[PDB]
Design brief:
The structure is cut from a larger assembly and holds two copies of chain A, one copy of chain B (38 residues), one copy of chain C (832 residues) and one copy of chain D (51 residues). Chain A has one helix and no strands. Chain A has one helix spanning 2-30. Chain B is rod-shaped and about 55 Å long. Chain D contains one helix and no strands. Chain D is elongated, with a radius of gyration of 21 Å. The chains are: A mainly alpha (34), B mainly alpha (38), C mainly alpha (832), D mainly alpha (51). Chains B and D meet through helix 1 and helix 2 of B and helix 1 of D. Chain C: InterPro entries: 26S_Psome_Rpn2 (IPR016642), ARM-like (IPR011989), ARM-type_fold (IPR016024), Proteasome/cyclosome_rpt (IPR002015), PSMD1_RPN2_N (IPR048570), RPN2_C (IPR040623). Chain C: It comes from Saccharomyces cerevisiae (strain ATCC 204508 / S288c). Chain C: Belongs to the proteasome subunit S1 family.
Amino acid sequence: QVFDERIKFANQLHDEYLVSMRYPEDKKTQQNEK
Amino acid sequence: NNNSALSNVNSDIYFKLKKLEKEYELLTLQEDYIKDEQ
Amino acid sequence: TTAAPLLALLRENQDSVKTYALESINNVVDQLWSEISNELPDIEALYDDDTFSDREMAALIASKVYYNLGEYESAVKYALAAKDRFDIDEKSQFVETIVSKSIEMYVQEASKQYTKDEQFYTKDIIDPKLTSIFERMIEKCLKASELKLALGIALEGYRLDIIESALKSKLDQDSTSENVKIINYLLTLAITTVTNSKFRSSILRKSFDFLMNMPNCDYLTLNKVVVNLNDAGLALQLFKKLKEENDEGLSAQIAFDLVSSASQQLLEILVTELTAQGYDPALLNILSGLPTCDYYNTFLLNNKNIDIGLLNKSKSSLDGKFSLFHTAVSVANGFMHAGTTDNSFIKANLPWLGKAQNWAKFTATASLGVIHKGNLLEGKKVMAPYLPGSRASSRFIKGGSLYGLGLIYAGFGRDTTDYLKNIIVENSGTSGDEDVDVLLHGASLGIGLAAMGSANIEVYEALKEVLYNDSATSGEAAALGMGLCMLGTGKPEAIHDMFTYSQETQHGNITRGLAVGLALINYGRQELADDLITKMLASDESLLRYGGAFTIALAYAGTGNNSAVKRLLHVAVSDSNDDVRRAAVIALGFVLLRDYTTVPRIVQLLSKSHNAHVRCGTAFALGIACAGKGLQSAIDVLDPLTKDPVDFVRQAAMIALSMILIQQTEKLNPQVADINKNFLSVITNKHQEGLAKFGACVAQGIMNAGGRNVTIQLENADTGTLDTKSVVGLVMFSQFWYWFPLAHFLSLSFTPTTVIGIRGSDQAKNKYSSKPYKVDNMTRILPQQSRYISFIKDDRFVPVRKFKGNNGVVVLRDREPKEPVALIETVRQMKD
Amino acid sequence: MTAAVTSSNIVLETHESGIKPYFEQKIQETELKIRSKTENVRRLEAQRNAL
Amino acid sequence: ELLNAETLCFTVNVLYPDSSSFKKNLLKFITSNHKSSVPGSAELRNSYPASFYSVNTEKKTIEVT
């Protein structure tokens, strides 16, 4: 049980980064550049 | 107001919106598929 | 202030004190909603009781508390359980959220109850209160102004009778132009929004009747309903109204418009009814379609401009000795000379022509039927020296003359069908001999074109025997020709017979041909052909899956359906046979002809993939979908595919670009010039494979096609509706890798763009300026140019309509009818 | 034409026009939904482009 | 900094149905101010379009308030 609660914190960090990572990248590639 | 027939064209915006937002469901079609493609 | 007394008064025992509790709670609920959310069951208890007449007042409170809570759906039920004191909140714009939620609920329910009966709002199928609410919400639309708001609301709610009454309120001739435009919006909305067959048909049909009621109206709008539903009865009634409004110019203008837009089935049925009703032969002559073929010939003659250096450069580099080289030039040459007799190249380069052989010589003979296309009076008298019984030097010439005959008469070949049927039934009993085999092959392609869209069961019989003969090369043409003749009939005997015979026969060419032909005969079958689609995809044969894609494409061609598109996406990625991956991509452009804006983005993904076949079919999908006037996104995706390190993707790409940029001047877009120039670099180079050179020579001839007079049209601007003929040409063209002669089917998509003003009393970027320049009648007019042309304010010839701003025949009123002025001569008059 | 001394629509179409955003409430709640879709459908595109 | 009557001036620069009247009252309480706070000495527009061209504001209705 102890290990699982730790794995669930690890999995929370895995979700959090995936969503936010590309989001500033998609607006910035939309906007014109050289 | 100063240019009348401002009650026909106002309902044409509404008409157009109900089309466009299904063409953004064409992106939710793609959404499932980019998951299946990768 | 505090909720503590208001909670306690509900719990305090006396009937009067419980009623007093409600009164306080209802007045202040935007500060106290949280506390009384927990004590909701007490509020429901007083409502249940019949010892109160403020049971309603308690129900009203429950809705209010749910609105602050966030549970908007359950608020509606208790709002309608109070029944009064809800008008107080229907004219509140700060809580019109619950009033709007009732309408959002109605729409979901109504989609269900329309499949039980079209009437469920004049019956007890749903709550009476929800129906009453729906129409009072539509009453609010009319307070603002203009029925138009209400019409969008009623469409989603499946209220047919509301739509009728609104539109008849505009049938008093407030202003005929405005009244027609009010109907006009709803026509376009019905195509794109509701795909339910029953509801969609009704809206067009009722609108069609309101247009007829008005004496003056657009006859564009009347034309749209007839073609979409493809009903000869509506077409007949249109002319019943023109029987009392009969004059040469008016009744002819609508006839010219009708033949271009309408399907082949609609004309065939309509003319006979006019014959039994009694009508001028002048109208019937238009509706046959002969006049308009002659006028296209005259236009090509006048504006015949052929750049001669393209042919010289291609001739020197693509040698006639090599089969691939010679064919590449032949296909470009016939397109270049399409519709005007040009045998000068043939005379000049006779030795180069003499290098041709086996099927390259058959292609050269078939080039003739492109060159002499149209010109139907001389069309059987210009192939006569090559038709059987006048040639014995090679069997290739005897065979390819029959294939070119079908081209010449394609679409009006009812008499040509008879000629070729005799040749087929004779040579359907033997196909083992060399001469007979080549002879029968061109006949079977010819009669597919000649009987195209006629569904002749005599032609089906004749080709069925060629199929059963198990011919070595003619079984391919038999299968394709049958689907041409039987287009979109979907007869169950034909389908079942063809589906099994691909299994029966082991020849490789026939199994491909039947796979493709099953798509043709099930063109426009959307859900009716669904089962066949399932079977063909589930086949593990490469052959049946290749055609499986195109049965979806043609069944759902030009339809905005996610499922149609969805299936094709699946095949491309998930299938591990390369040819089957390619076929899924090409098919995409056919479904999405109606809307091709989104197309380059879908295939953007597919071009990233580095499989030759996937990229190859991506090129074609872009060419197909974004043909006509270009799209910047389409151009971009194709550019890397032009420079691809794989020849098969390069050959595909050069051609696809020419469709997007067809007949676009380089002074109107600089990018066209670069892309033109690139083709020429390959045609000159003799260090690339013949495959790249094949695609370059053809792509350049496509750009300059018809002497620089024709363009690809997918959807007419005459009515804004899909062309049947267009789709057939393009899908056949996609098969040219497998068999080279099939290239010529592309000519079905080349259509001249010109404005031919006709005197209707005898039937004779961002360039803009306030400074006009003058343009002659019946010269090349691009669609860009059409919108900037306007007839002169004082003009001898003035169109009966106000000009439509697009290419076609526009009937003119001659101000002085007794004055002789110069007329432009017709080919019909020239001959005899 | 512009001011604030003369009220727009010579006031007759400002409370016969506040019934209208509730015809349109359904599409603009939905319009919010779409803004997140657009982000996502490129989000997963970048992943497969790299892959 | 730089005296406390700048807010009243800024109102006169932009359009006002009642906005100048409302801002007067607030400055009044802190010992009135109206000097170089009236058109021609607090007006920067005089045919300037970012501050709502003057001709267009006289002319007719639609608000930009």
